[PDB]
Amino acid sequence: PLAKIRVDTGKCVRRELLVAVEGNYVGQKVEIGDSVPVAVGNALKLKNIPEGTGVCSVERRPYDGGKMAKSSGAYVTVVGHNRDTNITTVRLPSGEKRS
Amino acid sequence: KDLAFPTAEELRTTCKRKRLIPQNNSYFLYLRCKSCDIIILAYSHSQTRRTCPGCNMVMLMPKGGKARIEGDVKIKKIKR
Amino acid sequence: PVKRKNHGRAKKNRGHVKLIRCDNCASAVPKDKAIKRFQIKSLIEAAAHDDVRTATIYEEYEVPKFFHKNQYCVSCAVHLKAVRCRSAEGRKDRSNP
Amino acid sequence: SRGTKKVGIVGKYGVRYGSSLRKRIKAIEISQHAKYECKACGKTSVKREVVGIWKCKACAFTFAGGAFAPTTSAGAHSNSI
Amino acid sequence: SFAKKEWFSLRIPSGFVTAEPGKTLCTKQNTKANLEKYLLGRNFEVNQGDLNPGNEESAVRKFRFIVNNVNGRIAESEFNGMELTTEKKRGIVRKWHTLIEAFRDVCTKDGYHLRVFVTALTKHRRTCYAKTSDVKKVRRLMFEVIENEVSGSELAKVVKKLSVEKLGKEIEKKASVILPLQNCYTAKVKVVKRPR
Amino acid sequence: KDLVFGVAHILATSNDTFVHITDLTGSETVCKVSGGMKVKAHRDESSPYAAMLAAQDAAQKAIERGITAVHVKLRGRGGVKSAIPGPGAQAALRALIRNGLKLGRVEDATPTPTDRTRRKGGRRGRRL
Amino acid sequence: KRNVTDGLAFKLPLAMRTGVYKVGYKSAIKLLQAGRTKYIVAAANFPSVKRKLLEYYAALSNNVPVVIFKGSNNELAKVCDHHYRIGVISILDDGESGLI
Amino acid sequence: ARMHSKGRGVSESTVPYNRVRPHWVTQSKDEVVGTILSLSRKGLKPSEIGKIMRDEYAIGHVRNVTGMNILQILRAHGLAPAIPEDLCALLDKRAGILSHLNTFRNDKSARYRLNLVESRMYRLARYYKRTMVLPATWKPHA
RNA sequence: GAACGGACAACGGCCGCGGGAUCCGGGGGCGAGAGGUGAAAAUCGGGGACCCCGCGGGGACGGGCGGAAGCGAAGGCGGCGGCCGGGGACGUGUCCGUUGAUCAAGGACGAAGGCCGGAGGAUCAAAGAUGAUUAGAUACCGUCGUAGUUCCGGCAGUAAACGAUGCCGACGGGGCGAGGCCAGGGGGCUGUGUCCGGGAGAAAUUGGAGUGUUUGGGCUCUGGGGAUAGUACGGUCGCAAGACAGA
Ligand SMILES: [Mg+2]
Ligand SMILES: [Mg+2]
Ligand SMILES: [Mg+2]
Ligand SMILES: [Mg+2]
Ligand SMILES: [Mg+2]
Ligand SMILES: [Mg+2]
Ligand SMILES: [Mg+2]
Ligand SMILES: [Mg+2]
Ligand SMILES: [Mg+2]
Ligand SMILES: [Zn+2]
Ligand SMILES: [Zn+2]
Ligand SMILES: [Zn+2]
DSSP states (O other): OEEEEEEEOSSOEEEEEEEOOTTOBTTOOOOBSSSOOOOTTOBOOGGGSOTTOEEOSBOSSTTSOOOBSOSTTOOEEEEEEETTTTEEEEEOTTSOEEO | OOSSSOOHHHHHHSOSTTSSSOOOSOOEEEEEOSSOOSEEEEETTOOSOEEOSSSOOEEEEOOSSSOEEOSSOEEEEOOO | OOOOTTTTSOOOSOSOOOEEEOTTTOOEEETTTSEEEEEEEESSOGGGHHHHHTTOSSTTOOOOEEEEEEEEOHHHHHHTTSSOOOOTTTTTOOOOO | OOOOSSOGGGGGGTTTTOHHHHHHHHHHHHHHHSOEEOTTTOOEEEEEEETTEEEETTTOOEEEOOSSSSOOHHHHHHHHO | OOTTEEEEEEEOOTTSSOSOOOEEEEEOOSSSHHHHHHHTTOEEEEEHHHHSSSOSTTOSEEEEEEEEEESSSEEEEEEEEEEEOHHHHTTSOOSSBOEEEEEEEEEOSSSOEEEEEEEEEEOOOOOBOOOHHHHHHHHHHHHHHHHHHHSSSOHHHHHHHHHHTHHHHHHHHHGGGTOOEEEEEEEEEEEEEOOO | OOOOEEEEEEEEOSSOEEEEEEOSSSSSEEEEEEGGGTOSSSTTTTSHHHHHHHHHHHHHHHHHTTOOEEEEEEEOOOTTSOOSOOTTHHHHHHHHHTTTOEEOOOEEOOOOOSSOOOOTTOSSOOOO | OOSOOOSHHHHHHHHHHSEEEEESHHHHHHHHHHTOOSEEEEETTSOHHHHHHHHHHHHHTTTOOEEEESSOHHHHTTSSOOSSOOSEEEEEEESSOOOO | OOSSSSOOOOOOOOOOSSOOOOSSOOSOHHHHHHHHHHHHHTTOOHHHHHHHHHHTSOOSOHHHHTSSOHHHHHHHTTOOOSSOHHHHHHHHHHHHHHHHHHHOTTOHHHHHHHHHHHHHHHHHHHHHHHTTSSOTTOOOOO
């Protein structure tokens, strides 16, 4: 399923769309940023995501919108962080370890 | 050795139920705190803390068998 | 008939003791039945100890001990002679010399 | 008046599809059709609406969950952290 | 086939008597960066009796040192770990006695994440066993004595504490109210994370 | 006592006896001579004779390559297999110090497990 | 495990067996508006905005304790009142417990 | 031996040979009964009543100072519980185990002890239904 | 039976931390073998093996302590911390007051191997493949290797599941031990081994396998010469293997 995310500011209402995460619910406060909390449903950069946590809709290039682990039951395990060179090695649902 | 007349030596050695008459090892007592004039009364093999109410100190704490008495307490058995 | 009162192993008030592997045969023997000989000897053998005195950098060097628990199954323990052939009344001995 | 001794909910499939396939889908058809307790209102009124979406019919609390259960093992583990 | 290899001495921090314990070697390189490629991952373990050549009863530990920097035929080598000698770690365990082991992950005052492994043996107060509640009691006492002694210190003084075995004697004093321990040793120290 | 130290890793398994000499780091190996280099029979590689000759050639190359003193780490196969150093363990150490290598801090360094994996042989064992 | 405790699982049925209470959210705001309630326990399952009004009104009225129960409506029915699940309990008076 | 084990433990309190009226207690027989009824409506069980009579007021048995048992006192004043203390202690043990198995369903050790406490519960209920202490249609809450 | 007290506990379920070893990947060194065996061969090795040092990945496993020591109803349970749960013994002027013992039927648990679905796969390893041995060798030995071994959900329901010894209960000699609780007076309860006697026994032996022709505590089960045969038929259960029962 898909998660319709409604964002309200002072200026406008943004209507965002994400693939639904197991544990999403209608009325959930989600946070989409760089270093938001690492609760289920939030979206943040992988450097601020701790290792061993299954993430989904992972971007392949930065600000791509999310490419990998997008169909049912899929998740991507964050294996490690190369904090120099700014590289995260992740485990894909096919078992492929991807930088 | 007579079975109907067991000597007082052997009775305290044997089990309380296995005596000729089942005899208690427990009793009651009086606890005397020094800062305190009243004498709180308690069981020998107590399962509850006993504290003197005014000038509050803990008198005896429960243990496996006989409750161990805490601090400076004069004790007096109660039998009559 | 029943040859040993303990039936060969030291198991009493257990149901199961985990198996260990024989150090000579790699057989699966329980830890209770297994013949265990703890040998503590020097690393350098006693014949060569005069030759290590001439060669140590250190004044008063203590040669280290070698620690190993030989654990033998029953078949190889009589074959390695870790257990000695005894009589029927000699079977009930338990003390080491 | 049980009706069936062993098949239960997969008695609708009759004799078709093989015993092991009917035995396999029985645990899932029990799972996908059952009412579950809403964790927002307390009532056993959560029913599946479509694959992946589970809604409580009492307090309209709808949530994204598993295909034929409200919770999967991978989904439970990410939420228990 | 061997004359292309040049020697390098090894250098420790000042904690011990010996500043330079030994010499490593490597082939001649054109750059300095290729020499750093060959050397700065290397590591070596030296016995404490070699780092303090006078005392021999403190020759039961061996200190592990990884090199971090080379400057002109000198390999600077920081602390990489301590471990008891195999003659010692097998000597301190006897039968008919309860062996008590504990480990603790702990950072120093500096950001050095260590994992300190301590052991102890219950002594004669015929089989000198301890109750496992008492083993849990000294193990909680082992956790606090590791955390007060190395997290209160920086690492250069912690490796002094491992050399003098202050971390072992503090267990034997503190746990003596519960258990008559003996051979309280820190069996192993690893560095798992460095501040940089 | 201006001698330079190296490490003598002496593996002594049941089939062979390596006499391996390296520097204090262990990453750079000065000389390694095994017992099978010294006899032509396969059954005599683990012998104390072949361990002597392997230690003779290893000590000679270590002295000419600037290793005067040595540290010894005796070793068996270890792991699931036999932790005991083999037959040519002592002969490799004896011939090493008897050929001009002044030893210090000899140690037993075998790979002892804290409860290993399953050992070869099967449950009934190696029936011979 | 020791058979009895003195926690909220013990005191709250004792207050309902010996004492005056009301179950339900409508009754909760009728008592808070009348100042008659001395203690409030809500399940964690209770709606947060309805829960926030109870906490606000209690902080108005003499700092009445509101306690979030570690459980749900169905686990508050695991105490003395058991005909139905319990969203919130307004304790008018607790006859024998040490709730207050 | 034990009903559901193999232990043959004998740790049991021994009553004295002679019931001794406690001269050390200062309070009357009607003062003792009022305290017991107060502790029962305070929430304590009849075993906990006699413990706190013995430890705090040094009344070793209330039969010494009253001539009635604690259940005889509660039955006299109508405060006899609906389910007896023996059965309610097994019911809280059964419910406590069963709530643990709600989140720990692999605990085959606890499901063994669940069928053991329920067997003691149904054994006790059959006796209490026999002597009219408990209604014949009584069921434990599932 | 219930409560309580201070203890005790490899009792279980789960969560988290950790340990080194085997194997693999990768880098550096070395330079000819290594492996394996009773002996060899297969195998890997200048495309740099083995060995030495670092890093990495992964699964499995808790060595030493570890014992005629603990716990559990049995199967079984051994790194550490925590949570939830359980347990017996002891102690007690706590409660209830006969609520009990044993069991057809019935129910639950039940090692290994096996089966089903899912995940995983380091070691070991049925089958299979080889190299040998041998008169032969479908085996023992070497190497490799699938199921499997591992985890989760279920099935299955068997073992030399043994103490080859049903459960409950009364009584019965000393000695030595390393259990737990209590007491403080080579003490009492309760476990647990051991040794010597008594008695028993065909004997080995044995604190019950004693208190049995001086034969009677209760309750359940089984045996009735060997073989046929734990086979067949019928039945029930199982996905199957088969199990139960049974001539
Ligand atoms: Mg068995
Ligand atoms: Mg029974
Ligand atoms: Mg009794
Ligand atoms: Mg290489
Ligand atoms: Mg199985
Ligand atoms: Mg299996
Ligand atoms: Mg499978
Ligand atoms: Mg293989
Ligand atoms: Mg048939
Ligand atoms: Zn006082
Ligand atoms: Zn063997
Ligand atoms: Zn709802």
